[PDB]
Amino acid sequence: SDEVSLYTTREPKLIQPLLDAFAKDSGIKVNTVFVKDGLLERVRAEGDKSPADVLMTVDIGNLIDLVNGGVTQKIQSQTLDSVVPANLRGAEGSWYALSLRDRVLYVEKDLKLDSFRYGDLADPKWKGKVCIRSGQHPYNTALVAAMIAHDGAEATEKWLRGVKANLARKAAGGDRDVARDILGGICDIGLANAYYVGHMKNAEPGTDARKWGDAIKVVRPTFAGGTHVNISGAAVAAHAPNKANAVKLLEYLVSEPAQTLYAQANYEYPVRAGVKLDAVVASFGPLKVDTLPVAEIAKYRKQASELVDKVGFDN
Ligand SMILES: [Fe+3]
């Protein structure tokens, strides 16, 4: 009755403040396990006696590995059912989106560039000018997976090769390192999540993070077609010892107060309507979402990852 356990790939500073707010509101302690990756391996290796209640990812692919991997159970909740859009959830409560995010182009603030198509990143004119993290990170495999859904595996492999040839340094680091390396003059552009820009641009003045943020502007590419969007999402673990408290945490996270935190503290987009965005995030302009369902993007996640490997993307 007294606690709940969260296993997640989320950044602690990007989830802790609303677990704190939940505990302070509910009286329910949130035990916490953060993981770089391998969420399915840890949950399945712990077996029947696993303490896991809630499993939280920052990628639909990752989320569906868990559902289709047999380590989840269905959720029955009128609140999640009424609040979360039917295009951003699993059938009969198998999984739910909690926030939205878009993978966009970081651009040196003074570069002339109003528009971008995702395909443009392969264009030879960007040679030696692109920064990106590992092509095997879920943010990217999902993006690659959507491109497979739009253009086929042949065109996607070709794009990956063009992108790899355009890279200014090795595909590694995190999303923030794109803004860093743009400030350092290593690259002029790079693919990364816009919510980090909101996080960096609001950072303490004088800090590196702040300088990175003030170096760049956001350009949202479209598919040659809207901007690619992914989710943070959760499922309840198959043998959750605290299922009721697990559902309570998820219901709390889709509430207006918590979705405000997603907007104003995480700089993401809420799944719930009527929540105001952060002023900096609002300044990127209106978001035109890719029509492709997130569950459809997940279809090609495995092929996406093989293609990234095939081209030796991180070499
Ligand atoms: Fe993230």
| Domain match, 64 and 104 both | no
Q: Which of 275, 290, 306 is the last residue of a domain?
A: 275
CA distances from 28 to 125, 226, 235 (A): 54, 40, 18
Tell how far the Cα of 130 is from the centroid of ligand 1, in angstroms.
20
Closest CA to 213 of 269, 267, 171, 173: 267
Tell how far the Cα of 36 is from the centroid of ligand 1, in angstroms.
11
| Domain match, 147 and 196 both | yes
* Beta partners for residue 103, in sequence order: 193
Note the maximum CA span of the chain: 60
Closest CA to 52 of 175, 250, 235: 235
| Domain match, 218 and 280 both | yes
Tell how far the Cα of 11 is from the centroid of ligand 1, in angstroms.
7
First to last CA, the chain: 50
Please count the CA atoms within 13 angstroms of the CA of 294 that sit on its side-chain side: 27
Tell how far the Cα of 74 is from the centroid of ligand 1, in angstroms.
25
Tell how far the Cα of 160 is from the centroid of ligand 1, in angstroms.
22
| Domain match, 221 and 311 both | yes
Tell how far the Cα of 124 is from the centroid of ligand 1, in angstroms.
29
DSSP three-state, residue 188: coil
DSSP three-state, residue 105: strand
| Domain match, 39 and 120 both | no
| Domain match, 190 and 231 both | no
Q: Are strands 3-8 and 54-57 parallel, antiparallel or unpaired?
A: parallel
| Domain match, 135 and 194 both | yes
Determine whether the annotation assigns residue 139 to a binding site.
yes
Q: State which approach was used to obtain the coordinates.
A: X-ray
Tell how far the Cα of 85 is from the centroid of ligand 1, in angstroms.
22
CA distance 77 to 48: 24
CB 194 within 8 A of CB 84: no
| Domain match, 303 and 178 both | yes
Determine whether the annotation assigns residue 195 to a binding site.
yes
Q: Which helix (H) or strand (E) segment is 191 a member of?
A: strand 189-193
CA distances from 101 to 23, 74, 104, 172, 197 (A): 25, 24, 9, 21, 12
**CB-based burial of residue 285 (10 Å sphere; 0-12 exposed, 13-18 middle, 19+ buried)?**
exposed
CATH of the domain at 20: 3.40.190.10
- Per the structure, the count of domains in the chain is 2
Domain membership of residue 54 as a residue range: 1-98+226-275
| Domain match, 80 and 168 both | no
**Sequence-distant (≥ 6) Cβ neighbours of residue 216 within 8 angstroms:** 106, 107, 108, 109, 179, 182, 183, 197
CA distance 23 to 212: 34
**CB-based burial of residue 173 (10 Å sphere; 0-12 exposed, 13-18 middle, 19+ buried)?**
middle
| Domain match, 232 and 221 both | no
The resolution in angstroms reads 2.4
| Domain match, 22 and 168 both | no
| Domain match, 125 and 148 both | yes
Tell how far the Cα of 1 is from the centroid of ligand 1, in angstroms.
31
Tell how far the Cα of 10 is from the centroid of ligand 1, in angstroms.
7
DSSP three-state, residue 8: strand
Per the listing, tokens 């969007």 go with: 229
